[PDB]
Amino acid sequence: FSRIVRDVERLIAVEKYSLQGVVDGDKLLVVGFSEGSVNAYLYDGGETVKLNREPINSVLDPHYGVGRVILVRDVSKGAEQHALFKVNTSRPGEEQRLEAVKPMRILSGVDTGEAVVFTGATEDRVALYALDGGGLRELARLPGFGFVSDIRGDLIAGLGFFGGGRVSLFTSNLSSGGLRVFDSGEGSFSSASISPGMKVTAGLETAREARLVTVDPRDGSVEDLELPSKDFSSYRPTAITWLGYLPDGRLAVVARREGRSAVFIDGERVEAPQGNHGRVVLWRGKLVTSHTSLSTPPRIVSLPSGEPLLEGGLPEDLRRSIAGSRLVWVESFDGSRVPTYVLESGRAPTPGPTVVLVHGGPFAEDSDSWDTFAASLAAAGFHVVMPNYRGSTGYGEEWRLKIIGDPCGGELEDVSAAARWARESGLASELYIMGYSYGGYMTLCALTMKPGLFKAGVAGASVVDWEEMYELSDAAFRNFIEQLTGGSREIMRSRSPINHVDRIKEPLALIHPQNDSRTPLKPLLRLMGELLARGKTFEAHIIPDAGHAINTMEDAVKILLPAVFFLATQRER
Amino acid sequence: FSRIVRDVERLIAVEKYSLQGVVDGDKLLVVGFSEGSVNAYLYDGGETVKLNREPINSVLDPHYGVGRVILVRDVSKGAEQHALFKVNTSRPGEEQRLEAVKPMRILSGVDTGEAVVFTGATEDRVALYALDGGGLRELARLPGFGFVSDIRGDLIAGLGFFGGGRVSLFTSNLSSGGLRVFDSGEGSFSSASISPGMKVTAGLETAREARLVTVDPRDGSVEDLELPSKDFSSYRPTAITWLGYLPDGRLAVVARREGRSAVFIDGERVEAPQGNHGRVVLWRGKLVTSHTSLSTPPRIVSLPSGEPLLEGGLPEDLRRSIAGSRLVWVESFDGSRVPTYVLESGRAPTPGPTVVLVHGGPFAEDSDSWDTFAASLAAAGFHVVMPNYRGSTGYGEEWRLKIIGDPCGGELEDVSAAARWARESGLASELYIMGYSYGGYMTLCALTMKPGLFKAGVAGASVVDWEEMYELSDAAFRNFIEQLTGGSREIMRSRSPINHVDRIKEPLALIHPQNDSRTPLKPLLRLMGELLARGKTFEAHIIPDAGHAINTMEDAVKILLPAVFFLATQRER
């Protein structure tokens, strides 16, 4: 149990890096979890320089070479009312709060150098904003969650979840605002970057595949974009992770199939370490991306050698605790094949104690990408099954959109199918479920709707009640709940696990940050009252002065430690 | 920290023993917290023999030599609805449930070998029961908490908390039942044992001094008992822990002053290890008692040598973590002197992080006795301050009875004076409050009524709302609440920290077993609601399938570990 603490601490503590851009002339801007919190750094080639003072949540996308960084930081103890802080790169550790922007949920943003352009959610709206030397301007109100993708000249390009789980492309004008929304009937836009010719290149993810298209923002004309090299189209990607024009005009694309990605410059394969990659930057005539895998914490590497620029290293005992990984295709209730990553623990027998670790989102995926939760479970003697239930990204629009209107429906059947597969295939001697956010909702749904499937469940930062949550949500989250539930009152009630507590037969652990503004604490307290009144076994841990986005080691530990303890305790019986 | 977990674990894991009597001819009957849980053992000079199968809570007091033991086990996952199980001492590990006794809160009991006589509380009454060969009989209904002390022949003697915090003597007849209650106007009876002459020898605790009396149960006449040796009366005890007749007719008395006890046989002092002692038994012609101190976990020893028969060795590193202890007399608001035990941690500076650790009860005391919580605090690098606030035992009837009608009044002032004493004496560089049960009530009362006094508070198994708790309480606890509060609804409301949440300014850690039936979880969930709605910082840890009485190592870890983590975190800032 003290060994579990050491394992969880060191898994959280290992340095994790994400590539944000190039700044300060010719230096990497990198967001790193290092020295126990999320900070932003310049990487010159040798020593990193820390840009921020206190922990941050993120940084805005910098235009190449801009001489500043815009930090995004929660100023509300985890409720995700962020403020923006400017740091001049020549003077690291000196912060200027951008006081023209009232705290709000910052969803995204780019800094051109002249203007800081972002989307943000308040109680009454999601909006696209620009802050220049003249002051703050609302460029447009957006229908739902929206994200700035790119800016070139006065053209802004972004992606919008504006209905039915579909992603629209949007543009606006930096100088005079407005909104133009481009919707594909074939699928969803997944990344965007403005070409030198002032067209929007976008990934378009259709039924079971992904391709690149050009959108002219003047008329709504969409063509297929063909590249000089044909490696990209032959790769037959299912998803586009990211794309962007480099300063030399070449289009870089990270695309993926089956939970691993590949890098392309102007269509041509650039070799990269196995796993997943993030944005690709040009830096000192070398391609640089982020790399991660189930065995590799996020790190910065140079392509095509794959040599690390910035990486944290795991202790050898923790590396060994992960025996192997594999993708399997689990047949579900309608014969659909649920792509399921399996992390085999080198610290459990086969069959052995097995956790179905259910991903959040739901528009997210279990890929060959580092997962601290999964790693801590493998360290603690559990195999880990991570099913890409319908709703997941990475496997086509059709699979992703199947969740719409059907929470605690087919996706739960997929999660249950992976569970039964883990037993039937001989992997699991016993079964647990665990999840954070939409994953925690799945824990609650599994224990309420599928009693006896799992031995016990962990529900972290859970959706508990669509109805009460709606009442407490900001404009983005209200809209997203509308989308997920299809605007159906019956769905919001019947698919809320708080309404099926009497069905629970298994021990449940609840973990919840008190200031969560995504999945609020209030319905969780009501759930505890229901568990109590109905004589159900439950454990609960409420984390102080924290919300949904964990950005310190001590909060990461508070969230994960009790989950690992609980399951380890359950394994004694 | 993993080092904290390890120390906490090792402190919990150390075996702790209580002496219950002599059975199976001439074998000691002990209850040991051992091998991870509370169990019953025979000891006859070598290895213990485990009598129970699953963990228990206690055993009933056996008459010398009886060939069986009656286990008391919680059969409601911590809610303290107990069933009785008999184990024939010749056939250890084979239990037979006494099915005539439906689950109830068993408060006490004696087993003559032919009749099991006990007190228990259901929802509607507290009663004295006898189970013999002809079945179960209710001998009498008691006004409130009552405990059987002794049976000789047909006579039963007990102690009753039957009004005003005062303890009465009561008798009954095993054959015919009934109830006779004897009050003293000078004080409270603390201990009782029937003499050969069929009168009741009792400890009478008065204003300051305690003495031995003889109560004739036929007419209620009381006279002082003078013993052959005068070491006892000249010791001038303030409290009488225990007394009992030995097989040879000698009267064993354990009495105490200033948190330390002494043992007497027919009034003659018997040398014993410094600290506190429990019952004294004759085993193979010689004297045996339990012993505990601040630096020695409860153990069974021979007198007068002090040689251990059953002892969980305190490892040297943990022992060394307590650099010292002191008894101080804190000046309270009204000139009262609050006897306060202090532990200096060998792992903190002076001045240094200090926890006022508040005792439960309130009719209990901090004495020179083992305290796992205090030890873990010392191990974690905190000085510990343990004030015997008014309401405490050990310092006379007047001091103990001051709390009556005044919860969250003078006693909280004593606690606050102890905080002030810690700072002003130079011990404390910073101050926290921590407590379980009435102690947790004090945490909550301190953060609501004395904001800014402590840096942070830990409230375990707390009283939260007198009124709601009363309505959820069984007959015993309803009566006790009436006595403690005076029955006034204004006291019940005004002295409930849930009605003062607005004033809270310090971080608060709530810890609570889910099935607690003394201090129920329900009002604590409401408190969390209020903390949430009023934007207060808090954490909470609810522990599964557990109640107020902790009987496993892992449950004690779930109760204690969050507290130490919380305080350690608080000390970083």
UniProtKB/Swiss-Prot annotation, chains A, B:
Coiled-coil segments on the chain, per record: none
Listed name of the protein: Acylamino-acid-releasing enzyme
Function: This enzyme catalyzes the hydrolysis of the N-terminal peptide bond of an N-acetylated peptide to generate an N-acetylated amino acid and a peptide with a free N-terminus.
GO biological process: proteolysis
Family matches, as InterPro entries: AB_hydrolase_fold, APH-like_N, Peptidase_S9_cat
Enzyme Commission numbers on file: 3.4.19.1
Keyword Cytoplasm applies: yes
Active-site feature positions: S437 (charge relay system), D516 (charge relay system), H548 (charge relay system)
GO molecular function: omega peptidase activity; serine-type endopeptidase activity
Primary location group: cytoplasm
Family: Belongs to the peptidase S9C family.
Listed GO CC annotations: cytoplasm
Cellular compartment(s): Cytoplasm
Pfam families linked to this entry: APH-like_N, Peptidase_S9
Cross-referenced Gene3D superfamilies: alpha/beta hydrolase, Peptidase/esterase 'gauge' domain
Entry keyword set: Cytoplasm, Hydrolase
Catalytic function, reaction form: Cleavage of an N-acetyl or N-formyl amino acid from the N-terminus of a polypeptide
UniProt organism field: Aeropyrum pernix (strain ATCC 700893 / DSM 11879 / JCM 9820 / NBRC 100138 / K1)
Superkingdom of this protein's organism: Archaea
